[PDB]
Structure formats: structure tokens, C-alpha cells
């Protein structure tokens, strides 16, 4: 299930074709407003524990926005995951 939600948020890179039109709200916002160069969610596993999150790369004046957006997405999913985005994931 975590991997599904991660897929929903996905990843991004400045060489992706298709910017504004991406399904990932984070990715689309990052692409249109140039919030970063690259991002990627992840789910590292070790025995009984793991790191679950995202890693991004960006300009010095965008760290705040990227974070906001990243986090707002995490919450949206916690509280408002809609049905179709889950199919996509």
C-alpha cells in the first residue's frame, strides 16, 4: 500500500517530457513553477524498520516550496486519497 501511495506522488526530473500535464500533483506543480530539478519518493526496507519518504534537489530559494508541496501531498493522501489515483498507483 505504501508503494502505491509512493507511485501516486512518483518522481520527477527536469528532462521528463510532459510537464504541466503530469498526474502527480507534486510533479506537475514542480514542473510548472520550476520547484526543482529532480525528486523521487522511496521506501527503504531493512529488518523491522525502514526509511519511507522522498529526496529532492533544487535551487536555494525553492526548498521551502518543495517541502510544502511534498508534505501537503503526503497529508492529502492520509486524509483524502480519491479512488482513481489509487488505480493509477
Amino acid at each position: 500500500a505504501l508503494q502505491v501511495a509512493n507511485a501516486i506522488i512518483g518522481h520527477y526530473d527536469c528532462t521528463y517530457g510532459g510537464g504541466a500535464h503530469l498526474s502527480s500533483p507534486l510533479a506537475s506543480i514542480a514542473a510548472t513553477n520550476k520547484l526543482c530539478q529532480s525528486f523521487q519518493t522511496f521506501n527503504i526496507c531493512y529488518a523491522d524498520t525502514g526509511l519511507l519518504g522522498a529526496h529532492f534537489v533544487c535551487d536555494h530559494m525553492s526548498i521551502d516550496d518543495m517541502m510544502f508541496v511534498l508534505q501537503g501531498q503526503w497529508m492529502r493522501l492520509c486524509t483524502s486519497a480519491t479512488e482513481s489515483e489509487v488505480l493509477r498507483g
Binding site: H60, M61, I63, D64
Partner: protein, 79 residues
Amino acid sequence: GRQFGHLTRVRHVITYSLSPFEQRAFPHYFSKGIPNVLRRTRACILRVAPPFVAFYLVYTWGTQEFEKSKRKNPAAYEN
């Protein structure tokens, strides 16, 4: 106005920090607290205290002489 990101230039400094929900809000409140305020008090008595006792001395002597100037006035008026 000035925002973070446009403040100034910083070279090579690491900053480790910890979540508030992971530490105590009052580490060694008294254990380390008291000793330190003693230390800060000590460190400053000599520049803060002196002018105040000076006022203190001038205040008690000042009222003293104010009463002893009139009340004490008589005194002697002998004839």
C-alpha cells in the same frame, strides 16, 4: 525586508538537531540551572549592583536628614 535564502554566505557547518517529542523540555532544570544563574549573577554583580547601593545609601540618609532638619529643629531655643 529580508528572507531566508538571501541572508548571507555560509561555508562548512553541520548542525545536528533533535525532535522536541524526542527530548526533555527541562533537561537538568535545577541540576544545571542554579549553578548557571549563580555564574551569570556573579559575572555581573559588580557592574549592576554598585550604583544601586549608592542610590540606596543616598535615599536613607536623604530622608533621615529631612526629618532631623525640621523635627529635630527644636533643638534649642533657650532664653
